[PDB]
Amino acid sequence: VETFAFQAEIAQLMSLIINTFYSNKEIFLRELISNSSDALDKIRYESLTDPSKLDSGKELHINLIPNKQDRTLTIVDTGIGMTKADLINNAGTIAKSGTKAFMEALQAGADISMIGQFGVGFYSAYLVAEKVTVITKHNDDEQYAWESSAGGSFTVRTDTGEPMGRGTKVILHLKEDQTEYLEERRIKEIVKKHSQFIGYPITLFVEK
Amino acid sequence: VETFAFQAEIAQLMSLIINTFYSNKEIFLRELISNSSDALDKIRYESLTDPSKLDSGKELHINLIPNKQDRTLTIVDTGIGMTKADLINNAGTIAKSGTKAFMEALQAGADISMIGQFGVGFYSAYLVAEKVTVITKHNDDEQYAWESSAGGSFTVRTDTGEPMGRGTKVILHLKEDQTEYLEERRIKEIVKKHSQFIGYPITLFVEK
């Protein structure tokens, strides 16, 4: 297990997401679905010039998986995935420059919901999650797990035994008071409100 | 000069953009600025692991250049640029799959302003332009010009004599009744309305 310090500006951003009073937390799902759609666009685009990039899976989709027993919401896509080097770049983000630009925007009247315009929308996961685990597989690397409970660090390790083929899984270990995001009715409502017209199918899995 | 047929679904999309009654044409600028911001994020991200990718220019920005004598509006960025192969892929888009998904969305109640969610927002240029010329330079290829006045085809040729260093210029040859988009007051209004909080600076050039 390798432990890395977050880029300072990201540590500050995460702090702001966790500590600022902001009731509209449901936008985390829009942001993670947007990231999945971007990852899916990338593999689709790459496949136009090299069809063998889909040998690791032809279906391009997003699955939403609530688990009330584990208190987790997982967002899975079959997009391009991330290499170990991507994960070491603050979970595949333009962390430093994006946060700096985002903070200047917040001072000029922007609000937290604009986070995705700055390339750091993944970190909106911390509106609802105490810990986030990212499992990912890119065609050019092995499967890895990235994890952070904030506090200024993240870990990276190889992930074996449950291979995915290609893509990214974002596992949200929800805060105790954010269990509404495990309810089917609530997830459907948020998808229709913010992610109604996406370039890929979204399947909401059922439990028990 | 090489001439290419558009992917059929793109030819249909362009037809729909040119012929459908839709008064909110100003969203073309939001879409082109969004594309520039995405291109700028890509070069910024690539530079995190290879700083020499900025040897072709360190400044990451967007310029908006109106020219009333030529009746053109140009959107310039210093993003990652496009290779010749990208241009041949319908001006660097997921043309086929994106248009198909976008058309299904329009039947389900989506409208033209959602075009950017489907990876084909560049084609919103045809809301206001009779012809579009794209000049582009990627670090791994030479400078090229892509052009189309719709009608089912586009051209690609090398572009010499006015080298850019790195990035993309989108030159909109405006329709005669769309000259409001050359007015400083109008461009400022549209940028503030739709692109107020972007991850990169936008400079609106002055004329005469």
Numbering used by the authors:
A (entry chain A), B (entry chain A): 17 to 224
Please give me the paper's original passages concerning this structure.
Here we report the investigation of the role of protein flexibility in the modulation of binding kinetics and equilibrium thermodynamics of drug binding to heat shock protein 90 (HSP90). HSP90 is one of the most abundant proteins in the cytoplasm of eukaryotic cells, comprising 2–5% of cytosolic protein under non-stressed conditions. It is a ubiquitous molecular chaperone intimately involved in a variety of pathways, including cell signaling, proliferation and survival, and protein folding. The N-terminal domain of HSP90 (N-HSP90) contains the nucleotide-binding site, which has been the target site for drugs interfering with ATP binding and ATPase activity. The unbound N-HSP90 has a highly flexible lid segment comprising residues 107–14137.
We determined crystal structures of the N-HSP90-L107A mutant in the apo-state and in complexes with representative loop- (1, 6) and helix-binding compounds. A change of the conformational stability upon mutation must also cause alteration of the conformational ensemble of the unbound protein in the direction of higher population of the helical conformation (even if such conformations exist only transiently) relative to the loop conformation, which should facilitate binding of the helix-binders.
